[PDB]
Amino acid sequence: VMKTVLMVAEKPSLAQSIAKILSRGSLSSHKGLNGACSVHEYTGTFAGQPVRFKMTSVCGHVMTLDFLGKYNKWDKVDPAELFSQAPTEKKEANPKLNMVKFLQVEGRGCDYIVLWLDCDKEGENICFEVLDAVLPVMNKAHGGEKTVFRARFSSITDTDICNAMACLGEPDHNEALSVDARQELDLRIGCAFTRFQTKYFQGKYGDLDSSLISFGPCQTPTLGFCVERHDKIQSFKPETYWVLQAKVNTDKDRSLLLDWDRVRVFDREIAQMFLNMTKLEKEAQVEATSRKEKAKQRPLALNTVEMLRVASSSLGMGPQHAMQTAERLYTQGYISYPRTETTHYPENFDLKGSLRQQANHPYWADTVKRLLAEGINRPRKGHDAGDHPPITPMKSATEAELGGDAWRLYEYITRHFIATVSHDCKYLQSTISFRIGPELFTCSGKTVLSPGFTEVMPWQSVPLEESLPTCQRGDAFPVGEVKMLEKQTNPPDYLTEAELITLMEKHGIGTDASIPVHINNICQRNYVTVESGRRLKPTNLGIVLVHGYYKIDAELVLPTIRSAVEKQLNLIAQGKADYRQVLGHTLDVFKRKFHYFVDSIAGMDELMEVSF
Amino acid sequence: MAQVAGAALSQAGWYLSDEGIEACTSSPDKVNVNDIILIALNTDLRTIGKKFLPSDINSGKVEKLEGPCVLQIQKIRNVAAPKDNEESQAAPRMLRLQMTDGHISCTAVEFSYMSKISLNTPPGTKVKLSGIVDIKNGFLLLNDSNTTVLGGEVEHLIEKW
DNA sequence: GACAGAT
Ligand SMILES: [Mn+2]
């Protein structure tokens, strides 16, 4: 008799959290027919009536676009037909998880529906996918009453969730259409270009046979970054600048290496005259002294981008490997959601308690016990993007419990968490300025007064240096030796994975869960080879492709078209442009660009002939 | 104007040839030393100058310049920065000016921060070297106490990248 | 017989 309301969310953890918050701890949980999705049940009030609440979760996207059948043959059609005359349907993504069947079975008898998907464009698209899957199996509407509801929330807190249940709205078909247009555009461009390129180059060069040459709005600019770095390395002319350093004996057996204030000189004669002014000078002269007390800022809350960067730089793991390890840890319940851009802790986060769990590990037992005794430091204010809270440890772990690779990622995460809550590193910077003839020199050193977050993060520590001698203005110190050094300008090195992730984030290429895939994709297609130090060296295939694109159409590699097209698609979200016209207009623009690429493909051949 | 004009130019520090002063002048019926100066600042020194800088000044055997003289910049380069990154601030700015009186060429170096002369100072500008200027290893040493930028507007042709 | 990007 009591009406049942379905409460679909986007991930099992979020579904469980919201169910726990709303049910005040009276859940009844059981697994559905996927294993990866659970159904929680409780009882409550909706629209002033007693109803039953069925909380369920999808495991991400439910659908993905694909051509019907003929345009999946790669030989019966030519790619030019994939822009306007290729109908696209929506099939089920992750068929291993029977998402559509599970949703229909759960909705076998529901009356209302409240859709707790995350507040973003992809969330709205998945919202409408779930609605299309669940609506045809519901219990219909008795009269003019509403049936579909939407809940908007910014953070997973009791008050926020209760308020979101208090005020309900409707889904945004405009954002859904924007995401659908983006997906269709990406499919129709990537598939057409890939099938032209890989079917052209497999018929002319035998070395490239049985190899896939792919084009895309993201991986092509990602490769273009590395190829640009390679071009900059190749077009480098070293120089021969001279420096001038002098050693001064402060004590009988103490020698100080001074640094020239004029850092470099690129003229040999000028360097020689400056040395000539300072040869027969055996008495230095002190002029200035500084005792400034600076500080080193503690790190912000852990971001997915920063985690990938550190895993690539220090730990020595690839982006996809790090993401898989983080996902395993999150599933096992050791770290929180590893795909967030929030670097600011929630106002109700229980920092003092999460820190008390890491109070028995011998690696940092002393630091945490001292910190909790003398009080914690408020974490730095940062950016709150409305996504999940930053990656923080949620359960105690030991190297025996975890493996040899999941422990290293866990160890960095928990050491980062303590650093964000610890104090700042305060150090004393001392500089002494010397007059050797008509010239000036400086010697600088650092002394740590009170170490802070460096205790739990030893790699970001002020290096140990000998204290500079105490002296005041007017003291005379014997001069040891003055010499020049014939230095050379160092060419830049190949782009690293850490540097590449920053570049993609600036230009909006790839989301949190797409950045690891794009780096691995260009590596699996032999565009770039991963070298020692996580340096991405372009291959002869990658160089030919990017250089060929600049000759024909620059708008296929430039790291600006992705943001430019995304701005156009936001017009559909705000209602300023209809979904049909924008999609058709952009497709014709690229379709014209496709024809120029095909007609001018002879340009890339003249570069590919040298390599293969 | 014969002796009085020659003395006026000599005191002002402009050392110009007799042909140069008789040609660069305008309105022969009536002119004044200020008019000669105004019209001279806009003329290339290579066509009107006179030989004052001692010969072989770039040999290191001369360690002093006496009297005020006006010279013309040919090119300016920042010796503390690489050729590609000419605007780099990783090192303090040091300028190597090449200077001409019309016939002989000399090289001067910014020995202390000169705010007036910058990397965008056009070729042909005039600088007066007042006082005693010291030459070490054939390089003049410039400061703010011995250089005055008098301007100048001669055909630039500096163009760009 | 392969494709795009995204959760
Ligand atoms: Mn999201």
Numbering used by the authors:
A (entry chain A): 0 to 611
B (entry chain B): 1 to 161
From the paper:
Type IA topoisomerases (TopoIAs) are present in all living organisms. They resolve DNA/RNA catenanes, knots and supercoils by breaking and rejoining single-stranded DNA/RNA segments and allowing the passage of another nucleic acid segment through the break. Topoisomerase III-β (TOP3B), the only RNA topoisomerase in metazoans, promotes R-loop disassembly and translation of mRNAs. We present a series of cryo-EM structures of human TOP3B with its cofactor TDRD3 during cleavage and rejoining of DNA or RNA, thus elucidating the roles of divalent metal ions and key enzyme residues in each step of the catalytic cycle.
At relatively low divalent-cation concentration (e.g. <1 mM), the cleaved DNA or RNA intermediates dominate while increasing the divalent-cation concentration favors the rejoining reaction. The DNA cleaved state was visualized by cryo-EM of cTOP3B-DNA in 0.5 mM Mn2+ with the catalytic Y336 covalently linked to the DNA scissile phosphate. This post-cleavage TOP3B state exhibits a relatively relaxed conformation with separated DNA ends and displaced MnC2+. Yet, despite a strong preference for the C-5 base, TOP3B retains the flexibility to accommodate varied DNA bases surrounding C-5, as evidenced by the comparison of two structures of cTOP3B with different DNA substrates. Different DNA backbone and base-stacking configurations can affect the binding affinity of the structural cation MnS2+, as we could not detect MnS2+ in the cleavage state when TOP3B bound to a different DNA substrate, but it was consistently present in the rejoining complexes. These two different DNA substrates exhibit different conformations in the TOP3B DNA binding groove.
